[PDB]
Amino acid sequence: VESRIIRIEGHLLDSGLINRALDMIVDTGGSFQVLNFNLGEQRQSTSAAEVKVSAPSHEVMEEIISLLIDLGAVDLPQDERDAKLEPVIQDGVAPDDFYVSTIYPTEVRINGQWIKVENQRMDGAIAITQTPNGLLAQCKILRDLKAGEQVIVDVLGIRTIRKTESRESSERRVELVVEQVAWELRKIRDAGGKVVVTAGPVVIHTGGGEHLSRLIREGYVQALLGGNAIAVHDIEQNMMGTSLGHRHHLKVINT
């Protein structure tokens, strides 16, 4: 179990900001404790709240701090640290536990300095370079990463720069059909026929996953045609029990 203390600022009560933060924490698998609350004097005054966050493991803590980063939460002035960096050793592959960018304006802390991320895009990694023009932080998609680059891992040393209010049919006509399809599918299998399946990620998103697995397992399917998403979503469901929440999704593709 792990604990952190975060700080949140803005119009906390009327924006629903502090409500969304608490929701993310509990729904993702952690728990919270509001330590203190300074109320602004006027409606447009800013308020502040310090919140202790608990997670059952590191993996779930960094999942939670990620979501909180988007909402603009920060570490105490005393707890600021540099982002951890790990190098790329194979083209197009990121190092384990790489941080996954979002669509929002982002700063990272390097050598005590806060640095703006360029070419900001969601579902990328952040690479760090020392250039003749200083430090460069840019989002890259996984397949653009080159062996040698430094990439942010873990969740330290990252904050977002949002504005303030940036941040503020019929059914047994079916068992009819089913009963028929079931029987056709039977005899074709027995007769040594050939069945082909096309499938979209919606198979995985509903319960469909393990049922299609059985079909293929018990000789009913002789070919499967799909796209990227059905394969990544199936593998995410079986490797983690989730189905896209982007960290899980990107971690699968990278692996």
Partner 1 sequence: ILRDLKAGEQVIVDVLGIRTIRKTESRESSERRVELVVEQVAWELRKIRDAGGKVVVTAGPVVIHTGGGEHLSRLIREGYVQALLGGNAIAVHDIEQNMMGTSLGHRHHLKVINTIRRHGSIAKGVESGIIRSGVMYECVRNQIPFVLAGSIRDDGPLPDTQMDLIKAQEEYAKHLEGAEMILMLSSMLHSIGVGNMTPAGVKMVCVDINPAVTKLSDRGSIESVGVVTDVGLFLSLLTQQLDKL
Partner 2 sequence: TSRIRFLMCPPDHYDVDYVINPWMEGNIHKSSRDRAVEQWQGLYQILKEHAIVDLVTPQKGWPDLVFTANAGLVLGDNVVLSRFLHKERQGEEPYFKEWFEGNGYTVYELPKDLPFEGAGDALLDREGRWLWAGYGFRSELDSHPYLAKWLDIEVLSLRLIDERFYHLDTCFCPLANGYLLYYPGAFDSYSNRLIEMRVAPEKRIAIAEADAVNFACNTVNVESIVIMNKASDALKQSLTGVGFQVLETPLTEFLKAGGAAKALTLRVTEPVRDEVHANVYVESRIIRIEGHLLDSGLINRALDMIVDTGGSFQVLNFNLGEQRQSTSAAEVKVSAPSHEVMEEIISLLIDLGAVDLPQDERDAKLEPVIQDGVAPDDFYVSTIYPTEVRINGQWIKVENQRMDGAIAITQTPNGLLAQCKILRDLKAGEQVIVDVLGIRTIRVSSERRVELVVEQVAWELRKIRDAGGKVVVTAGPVVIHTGGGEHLSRLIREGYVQALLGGNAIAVHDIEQNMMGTSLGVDMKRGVAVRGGHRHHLKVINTIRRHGSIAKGVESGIIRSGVMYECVRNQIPFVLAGSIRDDGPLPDTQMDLIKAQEEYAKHLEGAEMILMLSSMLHSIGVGNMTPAGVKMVCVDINPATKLSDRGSIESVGVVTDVGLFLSLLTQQLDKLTSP
CB of residue 172 to partner 1, shortest distance in Å: 6
CB of residue 147 to partner 1, shortest distance in Å: 44
Asked if residue 200 binds partner 2 (CB under 8 A), the reply is no
Residue 172 near which of partner 2, partner 1, none (CB within 5-8 Å, type-dependent):
partner 1
Q: Which tokens in the block code for residue 208?
A: 């469909």
CB of residue 171 to partner 1, shortest distance in Å: 4
228 is in an annotated binding site: yes
Contacts of partner 1 in 167-206 (CB under 8 A): 170-172, 206
Asked if residue 28 binds partner 2 (CB under 8 A), the reply is no
Binding mask 146-165 for partner 2 (x = CB under 8 A): -------------------x
HEC string of the chain? CEEEEEEEEECHHHHCHHHHHHHHHHHHCCEEEEEEEECCCCCCCCEEEEEEEEECCHHHHHHHHHHHHHHCCEECCCCCCCCEEEECCCCCCCCCCECCCCCCCEEEEECCEEEEEECCCCCCEEEEEEECCEEEEEEECHHHCCCCCEEEECCCCEEECCCCCCCCCCCCCHHHHHHHHHHHHHHHHHCCCCCEEECCCHHHHCCCHHHHHHHHHCCCCCEEECCHHHHHHHHHHHHHCCCCCHHHHHHHHHC
CB of residue 174 to partner 1, shortest distance in Å: 9
Contacts of partner 2 in 37-66 (CB under 8 A): 37, 39-45
Residue 120 near which of partner 2, partner 1, none (CB within 5-8 Å, type-dependent):
partner 2
229 is in an annotated binding site: yes
CB of residue 214 to partner 2, shortest distance in Å: 27
Which amino acids are annotated as binding site for NAD(+), given as ranges?
A: 228-229
User: Which residues are near partner 1 by CB under 8 A?
Assistant: 170-172, 206-207
